[PDB]
């Protein structure tokens, strides 16, 4: 019952307040799909023209152009921001480590093991468990993710002058979460903000 109270508090926090929970995210080399190149000390992920040299790995995505953060979060509260390149097809979210890495089930937001917001075909959508909800359009090119492991929720914010709520999900999480990302189409790039 007190989860609602904590959620309401976090929905009203300023960017400065959310940054008290800042975590440094870096992209995990062993998860990147071979169409995804990592650069800038593992803080930029881009769609590569040709295939990357990666060897197969049980954690590596082989169906969807995705990559995860290296660290997972099991307890406490965590906040990070991602800068998107204008007009790119891309997605920003969280997933359980037990999310599939092969097949259509590995796609972020299309299974019960992940939650995301996604820019695609000129729309912005929130996804979980293969259910999509179209969100109001915004010109924001930065997204903030507030993950609360203790009271069970994730909030997606559009970051411009201030933070603006995009969507939130309440969940009693059953295992640790990793930051999760999708990039698609030549030129698409996204970066973890400092
Ligand atoms: Cl894909
Ligand atoms: Cl943790
Ligand atoms: Cl688009
Ligand atoms: Cl809390
Ligand atoms: Cl703000």
Curated annotation (Swiss-Prot):
The protein here is known as: E3 ubiquitin/ISG15 ligase TRIM25
Species: Mus musculus
Q: Which residues form the B30.2/SPRY domain?
A: 5-194
Q: Which UniProt keywords apply?
A: Acetylation, Antiviral defense, Coiled coil, Cytoplasm, Immunity, Innate immunity, Isopeptide bond, Ligase, Metal-binding, Nucleus, Phosphoprotein, Transferase, Ubl conjugation, Ubl conjugation pathway, Zinc, Zinc-finger
Q: Which domain of life is it from?
A: Eukaryota
Q: Which residues of the full protein are shown?
A: 440 to 633 of 634
> GO cellular component terms?
cytoplasm; cytoplasmic stress granule; cytosol; nuclear body; nucleus
Gene of this entry: Trim25
S-S bonds: none
What is known about its subunit structure? Answer: Forms homodimers. Interacts (via SPRY domain) with RIGI (via CARD domain). Interacts with ZFHX3. Interacts with NLRP12; this interaction reduces the E3 ubiquitin ligase TRIM25-mediated 'Lys-63'-linked RIGI activation. Interacts with the KHDC3L/FILIA-OOEP/FLOPED scaffold complex and BLM at DNA replication forks. Interacts with RTN3; this interaction prevents RIGI ubiquitination. Interacts with YWHAE.
